[PDB]
C-alpha cells in the first residue's frame, strides 16, 4: 500500500492548466514545463530517444493532454496517374477500383479530378498543363460514363484527406495521406502544411450570404451531377451538417432546375443531385488565406487553409 | 493627426479627409501672406505654424538614439532642419525676433563603412554584403542567448558616427517650444551657378 | 491566454472625476440634408391600389446625417424656433415633474389642461406632436413603432419614447450617474454611411445630452437666399424677421465659421 | 486544456436574481464567442428569442448549431463563470431541468430551444436589463417527438385534435408545450426540404411492399395495422393493380436507403450530446459532445 | 541556364577533365553549363547586394505606476482575487447640526474586471524547444525558438499591463459625470434648500446655459486674443475645485511634487494635441518628476483572518485593529495607510502643473494606445 | 490511459474457439474493470431474434475488441473514440475488406450458429458499409418477397426473387447470402418486424405526401420547389382521397413520422468504424470509432 | 514579395516606429511589407 | 519509422562507372511459340454474327 502511493505519484499530476506568472522576462522553469510539448522526431541515439520520450506508452512522456496523434493512409499509385509537381497539402480522393485484388490504388487531386469531368466536353489551362493526356486517367475509372449516368459516382469515390509525403519514385508512387487527425508534415525539419484547394473550385459559403462566431469552421467537399458532366466544388462553412444540407440545397437551387429542364429524369436513378461530405474542421478566424500555385509555365489562384484537422465523413446526398 | 486615422480608413473617413485637405488648402496655405496682413500678432502666428509643421513630422527615425548634431552654445539635440528660400529667410528671422544660437556642432567627416575580409568573401562568392559582420557574429555565434537591449545595441546602430570629431557648423538656430531646429537657406549655392533653386 | 482580475472600489462619497469636452476634431456627420424614407422603416405598409403605391414609391425616390419630419401648422411662432427648445412643441422638462412617479409626469408631458412649462400663456406650439395620440408619436413613439425595421435610428425618437422620459423621472443624482455609467440609451453609430443603432458596449465611444435634456439647438435656417447673404454681410444688425421670410441664428454648442466668399461670421 | 469562461456582468445583481440563477447551476448555456472573458450580451438564447409573443424555433436551432455550448458552474455577484463544451473532452452534465425527463442509461442527449415557455426556463436580470434564457436539454427520442409535434402543428394549422397534438406525453408526466402560429420563412424552408423528401419518397417507393400490406391487412391484424381500421387505403388499390418485379424493386431500394440517411440528417438540427453512465441517484451523467 | 560566374577563388586540381569535353558538351552531358568564349571568358566583375542592417522596436514595458494615472488610484497586490466573491465598504458619516442628529450609513461595493488576451504559439517552437540541440545550426534555431516564446510571453504580460491601464481609464470614465453638470452641482448655492421642484428647474436651466457657453473651452481660447493663459487657468481651476476630493485616503502621503511637501491632489488625462497645447498655454510647468510608490501595497491573509475565511468566508480588512477594539485621526492614520507607506519614493517622469494651491499632474496616454493600433 | 476490461469466467475446445477470434469485437454491459459473464456480447438479445432491438443494444452499449483468452479470464480492451485500434476480419460470413472504407457493425443476420462461440458469447457482424446497406436491402426485400409468395404464390416466383437476392456484388467480390427459405409467417423470424415497419411507412407515405403538399402550397411562395416537384410523381397518387378523419389522419401522420425516424436512424448503418490501412496479408485493419 | 522572413540579429532601437502603423500599412505606404499574425509570427527555420 | 538522408553528388566530369554483363546464368523465358491473342488484348472487338 506504500508502493500504491508511488504508483499514484507516477499517475496523478496532469499538465498545469493554470500557472501564476509574475513577469514574462524571467521565463521560469515552471512555465517552461507548461509550454513544452514533447516532440515526435529525434536523432538515433539513446540520449535523444530518452530525451524526446518516444518510447512512452500511448502518449509521449520523458523519463492525454488533449492532443491526438494523426493516422497515416499509405497509398500506392502509378507514377503516370499523379503529378509529382503537386503541392504537399492537397486533398486527394481514392477511387474504389472494381477488381477484387488490386495492390495499386487510384487517387485523384481536384486538378486531376477536373480532367475526368472535362473530356467528353485559368483552372482548366493549369489542369491540362499538368496532366497531358486524360486517357491515362480516364481508364483508372473503367466505366466512367455508366457510373456518371446512373448517378453512382459519389459512393465509389471516398475522400482521403490531404497529402503529406510524396516520394518521387519512377513507376509506382507511394504517397502518404492523413485520413484522420491533426494534419502535420513528417519532415525532419518539422514544417507546417497548408491544405490547398484551387480557387475556382472553392466557393465560400459564409461570405456568399454576406454574429456568433464559432471556432471550428468545417470544409465541405461537394460532388454534384450536371448536364455538363459532374463537378467537384468545395465549401467552407461555420455551421452544422443540418445547416449545410439546407444551405447547399439553397445554393444549388438554380442548378437542379437547370439539369431538370435540359434533361427529364426518365428513370428512377437520375434523381440524386450528388452528395456532400465533411472533410474536417479548422479555425474560423485565420482560415483560407489566399495564395498562388506556380507550375513551370502558368499560375492559378488557390486557397490555402492552414492548420487543418482532417476528418472525413460519409456521403450525405443533396437532392 | 491620429484622431481620424485610428478607426481604420472606411469610406466615411476619406470623405472627411479630402474635405479637410480642401479646408486646410483654402485657409492655412501661404502662411507668409496672412502673416503680413495680420497686424500685431505676426510672431505668435508664425511661431504657431512652424511648430504645427514640426510636430506633424514623424520623428521616429531609427538612428535618433544616436546623439549627433547638437547645438554648440546650449548642448541640446537639434532635431530638425528648415530649408527655406533666401527672401523668406530674413522674414523668418525678423518675425521670430532673433536666433537662439549661432552655430551647431556636428561630424567633421563622413562615417567610414568599407568592406572587411568576411564581407569581401560574402561579396565575392554570394554577392551579398551585410552592414556590421562583427555584430552579426556577436549576436549569433558569440552570444545568441544574450538578447539585445537598446543600450546594448546603441553602439551597433551607430556605425562610427558617434566617434567622429565635433566642429562647429554655422547655421541659424531657432527655438520651437521644447525643440530646436536649424533654419538654413542655401540659395546662395545655386545663384552663383544659375541652377534652379 | 493570460487571465487577470482587478477589483476597484470608490473611496469618496460624491463624484471624483469630470470629463469635459475641450476641442472639436472634425464634425464627422456632414451636417446636411438627408431624409430617411418611411418606406425603408415601415416596409409592410402600403396603399390600396398596387400601381398607385408603385407610382408614389417611384416618384419620391424611395429606392450623411439622417433628418426627420415633425409636421406642424404654419402658425407656429418663429420666436419659439429661435430659442433652443424641444422640437415637439412642448417643454419636456422632467424635474418640474416629481420624482419616481407617473401621474404628474404624464400631466406635464402630455396633458394640456395645464399650460406650457416655459410659457405661462399657451399649451404648446403644435398640437400635432405634443398629444397622446398625435402625429409625432404615431411616427416615432415606440409603442406604435412595432414591427419596424430595427437599426435605422430615427433621431426624433429620442424626444418621444416614454421609457426614456420615465428614466428621466427618477432622482437627479441617480439620473446623472446612470447616464455616465450606462451609455446604452439606444444611440446612433460612430463611423457609418447611414446612422444605425449600436448594440455593443465598450467598443464605440459616444455620449448624448439629448437623451439627458430633450432639447435641440437650431441651425442656420433661412427662408430665402437674400437673408443668408445679408446675414453674412452685417452681423449685429441683420434682420431676424423680414416681411414673410425669416432667418434663425445658431446657438449651437459648437461654433462654425461660415466661409462665404470672404465674408466669415463668428 | 483550460476551459473556463468568466462572464463579467456590467452591473451588480440582487439577491433574488442570485438565488434564482443559483438553482440553475449545471444547466447548459450557449455563448457568443469562445474566448476567455465575455460580456453578458450574447449569452443565452435570449438574443434570438426576444421578449415578444412570436417565437421561431428553427432560428433558435440555427443559432444553437452556430454558437458554442457551455455549462453553468459558478455564479457570483457582478460575474458568473462558465465551462465550455469543446468536442474531445468528457463532461459531467447534471439533470437540473424543471420539466423532468428521465434520462436513459447511455442514451443520447439533445439540446433544444425552450419549448415549455419563455417564463419557465429563464432568469430575469433587470440589473443588466437583459434576459438569460436556458435551452432545454432532453433525451433524443423525446426531442424527436417534440420536433415532429411542432412540425405537425405547423402543417395542420390550415386544417382545424389540438390537445392530441399540442401536448407531449412521457412516462414521468405528460407536458404541454408552447405552440406558435407561423415559423416564418425558415420553418417553411425546413418543411420545403422535407416536402421535397416526402414527394420524392412517393415517387420512388416500391410496390411489392404495398402488395404485402394489402393482403396482410386482409390476413393479419396488428398494432402496426390497427390505425388503418381494417380499411386498405385506395392508393394501395390503385397502385397494386400492376405486377411485381424484383429488379425494379432493388433499383428502387438503392435510392430509398440512399435518401433515408439524408432524411435522418434532416432531423439533426441542434447539437447532439452522447451520454454514458447516467446515475438516477445523483442526476448527473458522464457525457461528451457528438 | 542555372549557373552563376562570380570571381571565385578556384581550387586548382590536376585532373584530366579537359579530355573529350566540347564533343560531350554539345550532346548534353551536363544539365546546365554556360560556355564563355572570347572576351567574356574572364573573372567577372564583383557585384553585390547590400543589406544595410536590420532593425526592430524595443517594446518598452509600461508599468502601471510608471505613469501618473496611478496618482488617481491606491493599489494593493491582493494575491487571491479569484477567491474574493465580494468587497464592501461601510461609511458612517456623522452630520453635525446648527442651533438656530443624523448619520448617513452608506455602502459602496467593489466590482471585478476580468481581462485576458490570447497569445498564440505554434507547435513547431515547442517541439524544437523541449528537445536538445546538438549541431550549431540547431542551436541557432533553438535560440530563435526560445526568443520567440519569451517574446510572446513578455508580449502577453505587456498586453495585460496595458489592459490594466485601459480598465482603469474606463472605470474612471464610468463614474465621471461631465463638466457642465458638476460646475453647478458642486456650487453649494443650489443644494442649500433640499432639492425641491423650482430649484431643480433652475438647475436644468443652468445646465443648458453652461452647455453652450462653457463647453469646448480650448476652442474658445483661440479668439480671446492674449488672454488665453488666464482663461485656461480660470477654467481648469474651477474644474479642479468642482471635484469633491473628500476621500478617506486623502490624508496619507501617496504622491508628492518631487521637490517638497506639496501633495498632487488630482491628475489630468488629455490627448496628444491637448497636451501639446496646454504645455504652451500654461507655458513652462513646475517640474518634470513626481515622487510616488515603486510597488504596490500588500494584503495577505493571516491565521486570525484565515480561520474566519475557512469558517464562513467574510474576511476582515484589518483584524488586528478590530482585536484592538478611543481613537482619533492621528491614532487611526496607520489603520487606513494599510501598506501605502514605506515605499521607497521613486520619481516618476510625468508632467505636473500648478493651479493655484493645487499641484495637479497632467499626462497623455496616446503614446500607450497608439502602439496598440486602437482608438483612444 | 488504462483501457483494459478483465472479464472473469474454460477448456481446450473453448480455448481453441476463442483463440481463433482474438481480433474480433463484441459489446459489453459497462465500461468498468471487472465484469460477469452475462454482460458480454449479444447474449441476452439473440437466443427470439429481432433486428431493431438488437441494433438498439448494439448502438446503446459500448464496444470492445478482445485481445487474449485464458483458461478462466478474457482480457479485453474497450474501444473509446479517443485513440486508434487494430481489428481483424475473422467472421464466418467472410467479406474481404479494403483500405479507407468505413466499417460497420450490424447484429448477426446470417445465423446464430455462424457467429457465436458455445461455451454465452455472440459476436456481432463486422463488414464494410456498402456491403452492409446492400445486404440490408437484400434481406428486407427478401422478407417482403417471401411473405407475398407465402400469401399469394402467383404474385412472384421463388426463382425470380433468388437470382438477385441470393448474391451481393461489391468491387468484383461476388458474395452469397444465407437466406431462410422457410421463414414462417406471422413474424417470428429475424427481420420479421423491420419489413413490417417498411411496409407501414411505404403505405402511409402517400397520405403524408398529399396533406403535406396541400398544406404548403397555400404558403404562397417560399421557394419554387414546393410546387416544382409536384410534377414528378404520378397523378394517380396526387388526387387520392383528400377527405379523412383529422384525428385519424393525425395519428397516421404521427405513426409514420416515428416509424420514419426510427427506420431512418436504423438505415444509418450504426456505430461506424473508419479504417485506414487494411492489409490482407496480415488480415489486420487500423481503425477507430467514428 | 522581396521581404525575407529569415531569422536575424534584430538590432533593437527605441524609436516609436509603430505610430499609426497598421492603418498606414493596410493602405500601403510601404512598397513591400508582410504581416505575420499568430503562428507565423516566429523566426523561420534555417 | 527511422529516416536517413544521403546526398550523393558527382565530382568527375565524364562517366565514372561502367557495367558490363559477364555471363549468363539462365534463360527464364522459353524461346518458344506462344503468341498472344487479340481476344485478350482487344476484348471489346467482335464480329456481326
Numbering used by the authors:
A (entry chain e): 9 to 71, 82 to 139, 150 to 238, 256 to 364
B (entry chain x): 199 to 395
C (entry chain W): 1087 to 1149, 1179 to 1381
D (entry chain f): 1 to 160, 172 to 301
E (entry chain W): 5 to 104, 113 to 337, 345 to 395
F (entry chain g): 1 to 9, 13 to 50, 54 to 125, 131 to 301
G (entry chain S): 5 to 50
H (entry chain T): 1087 to 1135
What does the paper say about this structure?
Epstein-Bar virus (EBV), a member of the subfamily gammaherpesviruses that also includes the Kaposi Sarcoma-associated herpesvirus (KSHV),2,3 is the first identified oncovirus. Similar to other members of the family herpesviridae, EBV has a characteristic three-layer configuration: the outer lipid bilayer envelope containing viral glycoproteins responsible for host recognizing and membrane fusion, the inner pseudo-icosahedral nucleocapsid enclosing a 172-kb double-strand DNA (dsDNA) genome and the middle pleomorphic tegument compartment fulfilled with 20–40 different viral proteins. All herpesvirus capsid shell consists of 4 abundant proteins: the major capsid proteins (MCP) constituting the basic capsid skeleton through forming 150 hexons and 11 pentons, the small capsid proteins (SCP) binding to the tops of hexon MCPs or both hexon and penton MCPs, and the Tri1 and Tri2 forming the heterotrimeric triplexes to plug the large holes on the capsid floor. Once the viral dsDNA genome enters the procapsid shell through the portal that is located at a unique 5-fold vertex of the icosahedral capsid, the viral nucleocapsid is joined by the capsid-associated tegument complexes (CATCs).
We also determined the high-resolution structure of the CATC in portal-proximal penton vertices where the CATC binds exclusively to a specific one of the five registers. In order to do so, we performed focused 3D classification of the portal-proximal penton-vertex sub-particles (extracted from the C1 capsid) with a mask encompassing a region containing only one CATC. We finally obtained 93,334 (83.3%) CATC-binding portal-proximal penton vertex sub-particles. Through 3D refinement, we obtained reconstruction of the C1 CATC-binding portal-proximal penton vertex at 4.3 Å. The structure of CATC in the portal-proximal penton vertex is essentially identical to that in the portal vertex. Unlike its counterpart in KSHV that interacts with only one MCP,22 the head domain of BVRF1 simultaneously contacts two neighboring penton MCPs, mainly through the region of residues 291–314. As such, pORF64 (the BVRF1 homolog in KSHV) interacts with one penton MCP at the apex, whereas the head domain of EBV BVRF1 simultaneously contacts two neighboring MCPs at the middle of the MCP tower region. Each CATC binds both triplexes Ta and Tc. The interactions between the CATC and Ta are exclusively mediated by BGLF1. The interactions between the CATC and triplex Tc occur at the vertex-distal end of the CATC.
